[PDB]
PDB file of C-alpha atoms in Angstrom:
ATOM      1  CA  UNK S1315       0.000   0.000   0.000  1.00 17.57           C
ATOM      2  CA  UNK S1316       1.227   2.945  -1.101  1.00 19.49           C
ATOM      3  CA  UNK S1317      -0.555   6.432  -0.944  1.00 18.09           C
ATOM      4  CA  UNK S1318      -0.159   8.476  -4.612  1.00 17.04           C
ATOM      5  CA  UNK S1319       1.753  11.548  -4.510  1.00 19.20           C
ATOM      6  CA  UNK S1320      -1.497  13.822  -5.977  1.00 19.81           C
ATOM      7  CA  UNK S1321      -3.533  12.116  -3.102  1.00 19.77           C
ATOM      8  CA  UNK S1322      -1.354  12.870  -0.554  1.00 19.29           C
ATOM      9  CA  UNK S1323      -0.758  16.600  -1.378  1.00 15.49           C
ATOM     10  CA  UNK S1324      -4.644  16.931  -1.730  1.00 14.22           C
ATOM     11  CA  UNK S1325      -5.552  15.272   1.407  1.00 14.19           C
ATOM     12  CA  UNK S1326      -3.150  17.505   3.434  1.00 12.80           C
ATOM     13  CA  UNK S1327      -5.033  20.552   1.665  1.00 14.35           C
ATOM     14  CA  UNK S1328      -6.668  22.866   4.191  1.00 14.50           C
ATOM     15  CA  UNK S1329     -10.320  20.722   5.342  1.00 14.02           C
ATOM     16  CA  UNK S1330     -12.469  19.764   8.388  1.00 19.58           C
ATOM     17  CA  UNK S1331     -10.325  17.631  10.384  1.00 19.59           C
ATOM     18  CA  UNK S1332     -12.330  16.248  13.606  1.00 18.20           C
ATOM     19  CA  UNK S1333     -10.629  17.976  16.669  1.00 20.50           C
ATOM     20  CA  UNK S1334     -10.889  17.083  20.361  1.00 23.00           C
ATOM     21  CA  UNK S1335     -12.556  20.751  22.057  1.00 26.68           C
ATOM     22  CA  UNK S1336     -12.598  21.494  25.279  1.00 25.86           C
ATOM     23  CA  UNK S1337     -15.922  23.037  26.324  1.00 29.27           C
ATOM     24  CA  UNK S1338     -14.931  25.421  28.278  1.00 28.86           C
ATOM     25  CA  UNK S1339     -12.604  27.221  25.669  1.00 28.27           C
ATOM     26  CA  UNK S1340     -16.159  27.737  23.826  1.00 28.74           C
ATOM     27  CA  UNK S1341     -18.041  28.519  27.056  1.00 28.52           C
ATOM     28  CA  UNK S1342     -15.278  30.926  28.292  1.00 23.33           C
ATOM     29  CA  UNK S1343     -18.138  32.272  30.726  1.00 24.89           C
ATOM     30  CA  UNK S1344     -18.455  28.672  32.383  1.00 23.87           C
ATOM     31  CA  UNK S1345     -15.474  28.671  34.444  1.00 22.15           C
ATOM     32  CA  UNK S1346     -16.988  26.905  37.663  1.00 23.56           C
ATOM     33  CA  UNK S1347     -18.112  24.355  35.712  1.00 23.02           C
ATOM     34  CA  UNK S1348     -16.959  21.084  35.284  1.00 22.30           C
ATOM     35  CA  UNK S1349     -18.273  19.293  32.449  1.00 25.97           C
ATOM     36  CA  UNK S1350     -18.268  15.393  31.199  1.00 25.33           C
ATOM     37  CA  UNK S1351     -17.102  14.674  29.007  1.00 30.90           C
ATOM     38  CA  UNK S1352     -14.165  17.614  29.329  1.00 31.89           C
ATOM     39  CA  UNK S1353     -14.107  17.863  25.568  1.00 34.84           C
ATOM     40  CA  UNK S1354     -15.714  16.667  22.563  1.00 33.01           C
ATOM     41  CA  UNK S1355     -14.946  16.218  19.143  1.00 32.39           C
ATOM     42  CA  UNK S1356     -15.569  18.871  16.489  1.00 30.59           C
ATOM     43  CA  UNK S1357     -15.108  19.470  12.930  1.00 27.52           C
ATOM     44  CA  UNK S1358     -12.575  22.586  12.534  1.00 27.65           C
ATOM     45  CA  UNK S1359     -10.318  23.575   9.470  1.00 27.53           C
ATOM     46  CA  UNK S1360      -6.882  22.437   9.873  1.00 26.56           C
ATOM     47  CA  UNK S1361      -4.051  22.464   7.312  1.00 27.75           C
ATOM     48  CA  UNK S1362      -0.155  22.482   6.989  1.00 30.91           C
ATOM     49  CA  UNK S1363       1.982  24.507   9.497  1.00 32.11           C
ATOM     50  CA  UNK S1364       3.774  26.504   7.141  1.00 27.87           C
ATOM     51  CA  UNK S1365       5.925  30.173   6.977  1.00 28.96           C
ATOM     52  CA  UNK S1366       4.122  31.357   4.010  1.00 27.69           C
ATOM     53  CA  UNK S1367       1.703  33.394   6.642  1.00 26.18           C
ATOM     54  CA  UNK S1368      -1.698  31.011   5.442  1.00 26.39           C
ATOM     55  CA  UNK S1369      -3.776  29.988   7.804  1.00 25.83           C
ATOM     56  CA  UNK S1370      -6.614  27.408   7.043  1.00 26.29           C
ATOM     57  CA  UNK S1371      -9.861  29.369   7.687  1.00 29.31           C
ATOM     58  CA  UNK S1372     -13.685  28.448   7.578  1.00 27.35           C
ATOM     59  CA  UNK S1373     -15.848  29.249   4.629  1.00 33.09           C
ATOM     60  CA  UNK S1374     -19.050  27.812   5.750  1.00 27.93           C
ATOM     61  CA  UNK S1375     -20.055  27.053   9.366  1.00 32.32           C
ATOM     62  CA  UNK S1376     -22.828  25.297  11.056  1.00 34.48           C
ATOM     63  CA  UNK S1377     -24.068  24.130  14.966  1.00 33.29           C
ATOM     64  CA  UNK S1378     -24.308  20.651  16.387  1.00 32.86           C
ATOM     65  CA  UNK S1379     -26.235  20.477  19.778  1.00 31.31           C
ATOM     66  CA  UNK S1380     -25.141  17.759  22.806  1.00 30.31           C
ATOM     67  CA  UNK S1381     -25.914  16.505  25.803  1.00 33.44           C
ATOM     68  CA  UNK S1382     -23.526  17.223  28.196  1.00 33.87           C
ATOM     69  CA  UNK S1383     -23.019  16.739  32.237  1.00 32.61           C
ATOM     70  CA  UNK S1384     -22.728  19.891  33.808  1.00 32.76           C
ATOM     71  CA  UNK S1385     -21.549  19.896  37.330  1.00 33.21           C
ATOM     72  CA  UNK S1386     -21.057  22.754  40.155  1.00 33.88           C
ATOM     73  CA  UNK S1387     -18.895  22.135  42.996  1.00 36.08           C
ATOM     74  CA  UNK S1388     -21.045  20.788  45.427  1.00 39.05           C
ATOM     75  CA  UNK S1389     -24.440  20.569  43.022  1.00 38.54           C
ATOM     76  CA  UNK S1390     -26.292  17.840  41.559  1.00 37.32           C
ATOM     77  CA  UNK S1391     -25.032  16.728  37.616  1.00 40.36           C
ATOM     78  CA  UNK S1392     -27.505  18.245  35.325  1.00 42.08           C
ATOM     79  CA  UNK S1393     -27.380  16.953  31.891  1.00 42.54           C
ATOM     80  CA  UNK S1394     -27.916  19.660  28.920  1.00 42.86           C
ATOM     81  CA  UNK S1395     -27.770  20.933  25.813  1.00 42.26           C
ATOM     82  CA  UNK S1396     -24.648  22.714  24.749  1.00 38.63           C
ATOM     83  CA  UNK S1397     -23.884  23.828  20.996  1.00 40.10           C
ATOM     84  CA  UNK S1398     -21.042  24.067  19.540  1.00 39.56           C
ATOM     85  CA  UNK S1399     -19.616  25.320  16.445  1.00 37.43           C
ATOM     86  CA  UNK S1400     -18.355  23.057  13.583  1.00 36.25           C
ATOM     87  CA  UNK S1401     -16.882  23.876   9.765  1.00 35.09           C
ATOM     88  CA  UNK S1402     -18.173  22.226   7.013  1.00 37.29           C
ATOM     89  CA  UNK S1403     -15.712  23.664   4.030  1.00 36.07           C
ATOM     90  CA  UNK S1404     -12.210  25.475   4.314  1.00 39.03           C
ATOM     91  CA  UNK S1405      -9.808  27.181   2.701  1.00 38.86           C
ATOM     92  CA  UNK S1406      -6.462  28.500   2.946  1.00 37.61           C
ATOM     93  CA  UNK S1407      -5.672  32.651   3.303  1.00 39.23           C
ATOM     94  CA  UNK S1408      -3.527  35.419   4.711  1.00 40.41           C
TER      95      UNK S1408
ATOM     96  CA  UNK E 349     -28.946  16.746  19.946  1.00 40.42           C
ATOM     97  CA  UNK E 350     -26.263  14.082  20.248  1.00 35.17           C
ATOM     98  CA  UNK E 351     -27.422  12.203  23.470  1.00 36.55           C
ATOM     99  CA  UNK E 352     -25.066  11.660  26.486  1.00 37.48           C
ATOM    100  CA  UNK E 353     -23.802   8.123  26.235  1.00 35.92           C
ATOM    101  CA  UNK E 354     -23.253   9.161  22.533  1.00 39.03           C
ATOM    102  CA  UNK E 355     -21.305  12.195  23.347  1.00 40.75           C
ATOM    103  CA  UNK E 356     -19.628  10.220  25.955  1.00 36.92           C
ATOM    104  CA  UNK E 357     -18.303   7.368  24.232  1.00 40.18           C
ATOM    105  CA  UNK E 358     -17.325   9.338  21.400  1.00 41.30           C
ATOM    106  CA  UNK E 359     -14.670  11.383  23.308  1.00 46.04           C
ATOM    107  CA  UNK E 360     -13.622   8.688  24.885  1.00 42.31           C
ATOM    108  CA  UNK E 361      -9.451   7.817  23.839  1.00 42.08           C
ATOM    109  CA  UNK E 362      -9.379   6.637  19.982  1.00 44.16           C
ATOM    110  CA  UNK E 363      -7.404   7.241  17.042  1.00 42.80           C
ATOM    111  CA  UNK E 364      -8.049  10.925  15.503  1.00 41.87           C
ATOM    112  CA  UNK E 365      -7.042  12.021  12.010  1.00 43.93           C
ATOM    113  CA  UNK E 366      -4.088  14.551  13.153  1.00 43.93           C
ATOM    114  CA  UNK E 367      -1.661  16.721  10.990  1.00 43.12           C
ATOM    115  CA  UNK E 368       1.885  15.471  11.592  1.00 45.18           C
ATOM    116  CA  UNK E 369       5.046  17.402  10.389  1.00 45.39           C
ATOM    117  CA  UNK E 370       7.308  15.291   8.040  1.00 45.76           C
ATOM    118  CA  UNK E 371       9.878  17.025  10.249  1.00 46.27           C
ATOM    119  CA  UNK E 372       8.436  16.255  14.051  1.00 46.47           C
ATOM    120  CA  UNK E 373       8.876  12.293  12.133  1.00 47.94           C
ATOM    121  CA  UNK E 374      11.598  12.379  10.693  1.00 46.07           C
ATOM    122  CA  UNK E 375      13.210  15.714  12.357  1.00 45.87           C
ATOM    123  CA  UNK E 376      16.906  14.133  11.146  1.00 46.12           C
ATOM    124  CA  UNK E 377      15.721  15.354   7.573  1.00 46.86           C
ATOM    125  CA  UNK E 378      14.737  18.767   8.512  1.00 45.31           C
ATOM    126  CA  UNK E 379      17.829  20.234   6.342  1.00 43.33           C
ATOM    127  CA  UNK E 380      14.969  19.146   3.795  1.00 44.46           C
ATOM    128  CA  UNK E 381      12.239  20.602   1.570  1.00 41.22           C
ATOM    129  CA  UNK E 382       9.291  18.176   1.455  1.00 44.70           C
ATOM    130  CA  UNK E 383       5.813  18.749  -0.062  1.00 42.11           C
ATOM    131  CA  UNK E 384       3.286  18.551   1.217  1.00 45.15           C
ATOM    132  CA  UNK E 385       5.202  19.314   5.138  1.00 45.16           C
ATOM    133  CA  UNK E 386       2.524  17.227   6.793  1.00 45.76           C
ATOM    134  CA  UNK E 387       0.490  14.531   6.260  1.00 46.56           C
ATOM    135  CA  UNK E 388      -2.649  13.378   7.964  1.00 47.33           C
ATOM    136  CA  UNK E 389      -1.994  10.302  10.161  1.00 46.19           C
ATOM    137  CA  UNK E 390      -4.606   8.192  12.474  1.00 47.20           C
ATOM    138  CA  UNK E 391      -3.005   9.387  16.046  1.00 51.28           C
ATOM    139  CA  UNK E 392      -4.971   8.626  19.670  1.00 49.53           C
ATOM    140  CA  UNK E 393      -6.469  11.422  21.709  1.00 50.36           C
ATOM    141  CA  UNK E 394      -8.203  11.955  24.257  1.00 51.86           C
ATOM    142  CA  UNK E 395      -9.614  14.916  26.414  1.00 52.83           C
ATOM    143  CA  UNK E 396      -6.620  16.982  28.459  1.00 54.86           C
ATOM    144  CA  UNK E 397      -6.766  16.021  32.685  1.00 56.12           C
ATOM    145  CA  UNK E 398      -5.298  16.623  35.581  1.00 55.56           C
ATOM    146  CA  UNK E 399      -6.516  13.240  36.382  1.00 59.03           C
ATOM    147  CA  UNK E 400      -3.027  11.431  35.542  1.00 60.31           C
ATOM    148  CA  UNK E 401      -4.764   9.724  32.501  1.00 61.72           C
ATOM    149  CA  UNK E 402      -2.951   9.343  29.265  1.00 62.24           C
ATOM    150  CA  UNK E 403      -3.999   7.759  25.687  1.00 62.30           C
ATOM    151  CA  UNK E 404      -1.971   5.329  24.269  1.00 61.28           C
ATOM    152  CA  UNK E 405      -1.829   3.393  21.308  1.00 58.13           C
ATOM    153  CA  UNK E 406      -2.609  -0.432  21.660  1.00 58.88           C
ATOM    154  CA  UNK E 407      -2.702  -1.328  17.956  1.00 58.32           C
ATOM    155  CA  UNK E 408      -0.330   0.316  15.424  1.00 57.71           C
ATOM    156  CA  UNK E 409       0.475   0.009  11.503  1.00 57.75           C
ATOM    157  CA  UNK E 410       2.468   1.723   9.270  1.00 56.29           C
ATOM    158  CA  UNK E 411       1.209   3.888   6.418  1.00 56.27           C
ATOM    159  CA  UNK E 412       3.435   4.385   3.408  1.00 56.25           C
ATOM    160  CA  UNK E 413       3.026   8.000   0.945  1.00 57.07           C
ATOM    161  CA  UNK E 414       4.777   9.206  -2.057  1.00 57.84           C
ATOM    162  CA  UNK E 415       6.448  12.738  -0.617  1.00 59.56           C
ATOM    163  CA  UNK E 416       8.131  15.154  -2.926  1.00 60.92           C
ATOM    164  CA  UNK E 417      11.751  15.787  -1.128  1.00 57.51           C
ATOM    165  CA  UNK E 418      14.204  18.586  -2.657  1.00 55.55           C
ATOM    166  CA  UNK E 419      17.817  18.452  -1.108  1.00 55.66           C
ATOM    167  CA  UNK E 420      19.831  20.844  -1.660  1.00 57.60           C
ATOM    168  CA  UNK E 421      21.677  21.136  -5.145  1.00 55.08           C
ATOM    169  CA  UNK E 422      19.401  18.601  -6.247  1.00 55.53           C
ATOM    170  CA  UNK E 423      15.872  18.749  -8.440  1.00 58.88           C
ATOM    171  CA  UNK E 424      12.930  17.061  -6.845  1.00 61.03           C
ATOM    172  CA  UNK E 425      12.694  13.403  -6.107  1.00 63.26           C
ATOM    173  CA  UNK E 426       9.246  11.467  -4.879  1.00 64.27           C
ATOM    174  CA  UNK E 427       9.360   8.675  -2.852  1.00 66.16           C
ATOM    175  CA  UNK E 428       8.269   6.228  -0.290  1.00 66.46           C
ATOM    176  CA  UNK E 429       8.127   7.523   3.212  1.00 67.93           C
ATOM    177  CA  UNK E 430       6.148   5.732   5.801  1.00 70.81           C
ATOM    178  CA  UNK E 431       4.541   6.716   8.917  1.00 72.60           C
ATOM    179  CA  UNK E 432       2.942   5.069  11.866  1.00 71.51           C
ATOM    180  CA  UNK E 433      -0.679   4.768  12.479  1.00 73.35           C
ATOM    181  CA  UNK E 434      -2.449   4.211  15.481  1.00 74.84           C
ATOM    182  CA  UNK E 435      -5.436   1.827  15.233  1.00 72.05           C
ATOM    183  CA  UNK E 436      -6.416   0.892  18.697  1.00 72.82           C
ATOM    184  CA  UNK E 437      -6.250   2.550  22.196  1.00 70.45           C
ATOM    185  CA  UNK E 438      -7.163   3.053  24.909  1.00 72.26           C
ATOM    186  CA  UNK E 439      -7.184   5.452  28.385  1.00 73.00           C
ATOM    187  CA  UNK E 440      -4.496   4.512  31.124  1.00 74.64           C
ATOM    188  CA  UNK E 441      -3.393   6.063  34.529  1.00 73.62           C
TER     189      UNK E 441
END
């Protein structure tokens, strides 16, 4: 098995790559919160580390809704609804 | 709405498609030019913790890919490079 050349170099082009998220970096106003799971998996534009100064950027966005434990310190786990954002198509710019 | 156990299960350690540098695996060619400079690999992950618990590979495979490398004072050459894969895994302390 051995992956073409044009393959490779078009698979490593900018796309969706699922990416472990933790919640609270997208509920920054949640910080006494502990949540389970801690993170969750999310589609979000990656693409090559390079020093050209591109970055891999969304073009078209949508929301996917979870259930998620949500505990407070000394509170009872509630289970809710949390959305998060996802990208569905990428591409590389300044 | 993804339920619970869904959510749960699916963060739970497995193998992740994850951009890895040509250089960060093989950093003893990083005198090198290669194209593309990374190439998406199957790696484990898991959520971050200050719980002590890692993910580790308990299944692995290589993967080989044609990779355009320039020395220098040379034209471009394509060839074989492989990589390893990680196709099991699971959370440990």
């Amino acid at each position: 098995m051995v992956v073409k050349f044009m393959d490779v170099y078009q698979r490593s082009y900018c796309h969706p790559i699922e990416t472990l998220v933790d919640i609270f970096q997208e509920y920054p106003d949640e910080i006494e919160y502990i949540f389970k799971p801690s993170c969750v998996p999310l589609m979000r534009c990656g693409g090559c580390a390079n020093d050209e100064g591109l970055e891999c950027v969304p073009t078209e966005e949508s929301n996917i809704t979870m259930q998620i434990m949500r505990i407070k310190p000394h509170q009872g786990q509630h289970i809710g609804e949390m959305s998060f954002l996802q990208h569905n198509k990428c591409e590389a710019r300044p």
